[PDB]
Amino acid sequence: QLPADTKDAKPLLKEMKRGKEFHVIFDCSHEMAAGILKQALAMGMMTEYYHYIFTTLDLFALDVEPYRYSGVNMTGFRILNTENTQVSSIIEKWSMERLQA
Amino acid sequence: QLPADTKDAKPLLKEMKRGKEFHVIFDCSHEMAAGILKQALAMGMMTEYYH
């Protein structure tokens, strides 16, 4: 379990490195899924050994630039049908409604 | 040798990961020593194996 009060998972991820746990299933929101990976990159846990399955359906909204060349095995689902031209046109119109954010 | 023109050592560090080279002696300045480590953290080479 992630810690309740703080948002620093260094005491959790150090117990996961020491116990040799290379296969992790995170049950988080995507606001906290980006928070663990910056605390898993500050530790030595973004290697080619680790596999991360994420329960959330908003993995596609992560800004994964630094984890892209590491060779990490991030996996997850997506229900948002971003392949259709008609569906992708509505999402482009959604970005033209959130200018002040 | 680090690349001359660019300051992106991704084609160098990928050949060092693939060749299993865990013991590296950098001959750099400290302005470029900080530049390699951000390009060694973007790859999976800041582990407990590397010296």
Tell me whether A41 touches chain B (CB under 8 Å).
Answer: yes
CB contact under 8 A, B41 and A44: no
CB contact under 8 A, A44 and B47: yes
Number of CB atoms found within 10 A of residue B47's CB? 15
Kindly state the tokens that stand for A74: 């991030």
Determine contact, residues A15/A25, Cβ cutoff 8 Å: no
Residue A34: closest CA among A13, A15, A7, A14:
A7
DSSP lists the bridge partners of residue A57 as: none
List the determination method.
Answer: cryo-EM
CB contact under 8 A, B42 and A72: no
Q: In chain B, which residues have their Cβ closer than 8 Å to the Cβ of A66? A: 41-42
Task: Please state, in angstroms and rounded to a whole number, the distance separating the CA atoms of residues A62 and A52.
Answer: 14
DSSP lists the bridge partners of residue A54 as: A26, A76
Cα distances (angstroms) measured from residue A83 to each of A79, A88, A90: 11, 7, 12
Q: How many CB pairs under 8 A join A and B?
A: 20
Tell me whether A66 touches chain B (CB under 8 Å).
Answer: yes
Number of CB atoms found within 10 A of residue B3's CB? 11
Q: What is the resolution of this structure in A?
A: 3.5
